[PDB]
């Protein structure tokens, strides 16, 4: 059901909508979106679960 409500398709459009929820109104430069998501959960320095 989840897949149906989500009109977005590829990795990139997902990263776009991700970025557009986090920074609504900032133009979706590709590398900016990728860097955002990556740094959100996979940044060593930002993210430590301990």
């Amino acid at each position: 059901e989840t897949l149906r409500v989500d009109p977005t398709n590829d990795r990139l459009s997902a990263l776009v909508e991700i970025y557009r929820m986090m920074r609504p109104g900032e133009p979706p430069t590709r590398e900016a979106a990728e860097s955002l998501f990556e740094n959100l959960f996979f940044s060593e320095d930002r993210y430590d679960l301990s």
Partner: protein, 64 residues
Amino acid sequence: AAAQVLSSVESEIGRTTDPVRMYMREMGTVELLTREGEIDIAKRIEDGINQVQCSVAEYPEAIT
């Protein structure tokens, strides 16, 4: 085409009052030709100034 990309991003702008974002967007469209492009417009400066000076030499009241 640059303006078209501005407007699509503007259709999504979710009332983000942050003027940082706004300025960043506009500047983001305007590219920057370097090297000689800069000197191009510098030449336009020089010729504008001399233009008015030509008038000063030619014009009666100006020398007065």
